């Protein structure tokens, strides 16, 4: 129970939802065949990423996409982190990561908390909040190995989320997400290394594969980082399944060697969750 | 006053305190001559770093070392961040960074909050709390350009300190410190880049030069990082003065482009301070 196999599906995403679902589910099955215990799909894995796409590809949960995820998690007896999909609920749209357990049960649903609203002149302008609404809950789930915490993409820029997850006992944080050709080289690896080292947790990112013709061009480079801040493995830009064997004994040893989680000064500061 | 010149004195530290003070003050004068507005010395700049050294090199504040720093800040008309020195007060010893303004006045004194207590088997064991006591206050000072926040070395591992400084309006964080041949390659650059990008501030580290014969062998590599997480400049291992022109207009533009400080979810989390 000290080591488990994590698989990150760096899916090539097309404009045809059923195509994405077919290929996503077949890659999940392959990951399970190669011994993965936890599998993650990437952000917006079932449809193109963009504000004019979300309304038309959005589904209720349960719906077409989550029913397929549920079924494949059950048939493969794995924990399946469902990347994210656009979700409709009560006249609002969300960017939502659904997680299914080895019995097909929904364990948790994470609606992206911090929406992707940036403007880098001459590089990338995105206003996710013009169509989507933000989530208002912390999201974790339990496995036999450890507790896992969730964020989606831009959520990775907010240190407090990882701090709260670490407080709550999470030992792996998974962030389905797609950075771009500007934010990718600058920030993608740095941010996930920061989250890992500062909170002494494993961190994994699940990105779609790069499609240079898409309106939003994904960085790629799905990555796993250990509690020492070391990159354990890193994909390229192409479609692949990335595997890592997550060693929780190593985490325990790191937390003893440089014991920053036990050295916090609660008389001076605290990160409070509401 | 949107740009100012920062100098980091990467001092080679000897066992003779007066030698360190002589050379520190001459390098400060040189930095001021080359137009530095804020100058920082490194951690434990006046004496060898180690638990059996602190008691014997410790001084009260004011004392020999701080009197020299006060005088040189006065005569050079600069803000001088006094690295750190071992400080004695009321039967206790601290690791203390004293800051003097252009009139020679003490602006603030930062006693290291998180003491350097680690044990990496086969590599480095240090127990700063054998002899030192921790500080219990946040430390900032004002300049005509911006507010500056302070930590010493291991303080840099504690994200919350930088979060609180950013809340309080700091635009530059300075950490005098010496990592070692184990923690240096793993964590030195990562941590400072994390503090910079997460809080959208400039971050600077002032290390002593490496002495391979010292009991604690310093990593070196004094560094300045911008709010985009980009390394602006980085020293080698040898004694030098590192200069950087800190562009606060750039900081303001970054905080608009990726406006994470304005996108915090205070309904879900807060970093609370004493």
UniProtKB/Swiss-Prot annotation, chains A, B:
Localization annotation: Cytoplasm
Catalytic residues as annotated in Swiss-Prot or TrEMBL: 43 (proton acceptor), 112 (proton donor), 153 (nucleophile)
Top-level enzyme category: hydrolase
Catalytic activity, reaction form: a monoamide of a dicarboxylate + H2O = a dicarboxylate + NH4(+); 2-oxoglutaramate + H2O = 2-oxoglutarate + NH4(+); 2-oxosuccinamate + H2O = oxaloacetate + NH4(+)
UniProt keyword list: Acetylation, Cytoplasm, Hydrolase, Phosphoprotein
GO process terms (BP): asparagine metabolic process; glutamine metabolic process; oxaloacetate metabolic process
EC number(s) recorded for this UniProt protein: 3.5.1.3
Chain positions found as N6-acetyllysine: 68
Cellular component, GO, one term: mitochondrion
Residues carrying Phosphoserine: 26
Modified residues (N6-succinyllysine): 68, 123, 130
The UniProt record lists the keyword Metal-binding: no
Primary localisation category: cytoplasm
GO MF entry, a single one: 2-oxoglutaramate amidase activity
Every CN hydrolase domain range: 4-248
Function: Has omega-amidase activity. The role of omega-amidase is to remove potentially toxic intermediates by converting 2-oxoglutaramate and 2-oxosuccinamate to biologically useful 2-oxoglutarate and oxaloacetate, respectively. Can also hydrolyze gamma-monomethyl-alpha-ketoglutarate in vitro.
Family: Belongs to the carbon-nitrogen hydrolase superfamily. NIT1/NIT2 family.
Assembly information from the UniProt record: Homodimer.
Cited PANTHER family: NITRILASE-RELATED, OMEGA-AMIDASE NIT2
Protein name per its UniProtKB record: Omega-amidase NIT2
Organism (species): Mus musculus
Organism ancestry: Eukaryota, Metazoa, Chordata, Craniata, Vertebrata
Gene: Nit2
């Amino acid at each position: 129970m000290s080591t488990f196999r994590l698989a990150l599906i760096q899916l090539q995403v097309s404009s045809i939802k059923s195509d994405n679902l077919t290929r996503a589910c077949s890659l999940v099955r392959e990951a399970a065949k190669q011994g993965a215990n936890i599998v993650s799909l990437p952000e917006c894995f079932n449809s193109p990423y963009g504000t004019t796409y979300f309304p038309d590809y959005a589904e209720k949960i349960p719906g077409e996409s989550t029913q397929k995820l549920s079924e494949v998690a059950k048939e493969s007896s794995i924990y399946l982190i469902g990347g994210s999909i656009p979700e409709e609920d009560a006249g609002k749209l969300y960017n939502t990561c659904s997680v299914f357990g080895p019995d097909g049960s929904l364990l948790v649903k994470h609606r992206k908390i911090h929406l992707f609203d940036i403007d880098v002149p001459g590089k990338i302008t995105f206003q996710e909040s013009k169509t989507l609404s933000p989530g208002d809950s912390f999201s974790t789930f339990d496995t036999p190995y450890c507790k896992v915490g969730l964020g989606i993409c831009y959520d990775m820029r907010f240190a407090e989320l990882a701090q709260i997850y670490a407080q709550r006992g999470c030992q792996l944080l998974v962030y389905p997400g797609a950075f771009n050709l500007t934010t990718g080289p600058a920030h993608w690896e740095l941010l996930q290394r920061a989250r890992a080292v500062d909170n002494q947790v494993y961190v994994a990112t699940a990105s779609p594969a790069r499609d240079d013709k898409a309106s939003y061009v994904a960085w790629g480079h799905s990555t796993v980082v250990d509690p020492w801040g070391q990159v354990l493995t890193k994909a390229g830009t192409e479609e692949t399944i990335l595997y890592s064997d997550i060693d929780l004994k190593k985490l325990a040893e790191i937390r003893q060697q440089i014991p920053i989680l036990k050295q916090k000064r609660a008389d001076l500061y605290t990160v409070e969750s509401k």
